[PDB]
Amino acid sequence: AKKVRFYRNGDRYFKGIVYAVSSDRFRSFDALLADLTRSLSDNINLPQGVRYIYTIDGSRKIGSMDELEEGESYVCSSDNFFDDVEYTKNVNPNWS
Amino acid sequence: AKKVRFYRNGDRYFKGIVYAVSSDRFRSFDALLADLTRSLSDNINLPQGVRYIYTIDGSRKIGSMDELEEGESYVCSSDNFFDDVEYTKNVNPNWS
Structure with missing residues (x-):
C-alpha cells in the first residue's frame, strides 16, 4: 500500500499524518475523507471536515485515490480554496 | 561562502534562518555567536543568547566555523544541554 502525508489547510504548525492508502482499507474516496475528518479536524481546524484535497502547492484538487502519489503531501480543506x-515537516533525525 | 541553517534550542515552530558563513563575514566564532544572538533571541528564546551550537540531533557541540557543514542544520542554545x-522546515514548494 501507498503512503502519503496529509496536512490541514492553513495550519503552519501541524506536521501532517501519514496514511497507508489502498482499496482494501478505503472502499471509496468519501470513506477516506471521513477518516481524514476524524484524524485532522479539531476545535480550530476544518470547520466542515475534509471536503477537498489539494496538492502541496494548491495547483489542483485530488478527486480520487488513484491521483494520490506515493510519498507526496496533500492539504485537506473544508473550503474550495x-x-x-508554509506547511512543515520534521528535520530532527531522532524523530524520522 | 558556506550556507547553513540555524535553529534555536527547544523551539519546534521556528523554521531556522540561513546564514552565509565565511572568515570574510565573521572574523571569529564569537562574532558569529553574537550575530546569532541578535537574529535568534527573543522574549521567549535564548535567555542568555547563543553560547553553544549543537548538531541537529544534539550528538555534539560545534566549536569553530570549520566544523560547520554546507547545507546542514544546527541548534543554537544558551544552555549546555x-x-x-522536532525541529521543522517548510515543504511548500511556493516558499523554498
Whole structure:
C-alpha cells in the first residue's frame, strides 16, 4: 500500500499524518475523507471536515485515490480554496 | 561562502534562518555567536543568547566555523544541554 502525508489547510504548525492508502482499507474516496475528518479536524481546524484535497502547492484538487502519489503531501480543506502557508515537516533525525 | 541553517534550542515552530558563513563575514566564532544572538533571541528564546551550537540531533557541540557543514542544520542554545524537539522546515514548494 501507498503512503502519503496529509496536512490541514492553513495550519503552519501541524506536521501532517501519514496514511497507508489502498482499496482494501478505503472502499471509496468519501470513506477516506471521513477518516481524514476524524484524524485532522479539531476545535480550530476544518470547520466542515475534509471536503477537498489539494496538492502541496494548491495547483489542483485530488478527486480520487488513484491521483494520490506515493510519498507526496496533500492539504485537506473544508473550503474550495487553498491556504498558501508554509506547511512543515520534521528535520530532527531522532524523530524520522 | 558556506550556507547553513540555524535553529534555536527547544523551539519546534521556528523554521531556522540561513546564514552565509565565511572568515570574510565573521572574523571569529564569537562574532558569529553574537550575530546569532541578535537574529535568534527573543522574549521567549535564548535567555542568555547563543553560547553553544549543537548538531541537529544534539550528538555534539560545534566549536569553530570549520566544523560547520554546507547545507546542514544546527541548534543554537544558551544552555549546555540539547532540547530533543522536532525541529521543522517548510515543504511548500511556493516558499523554498
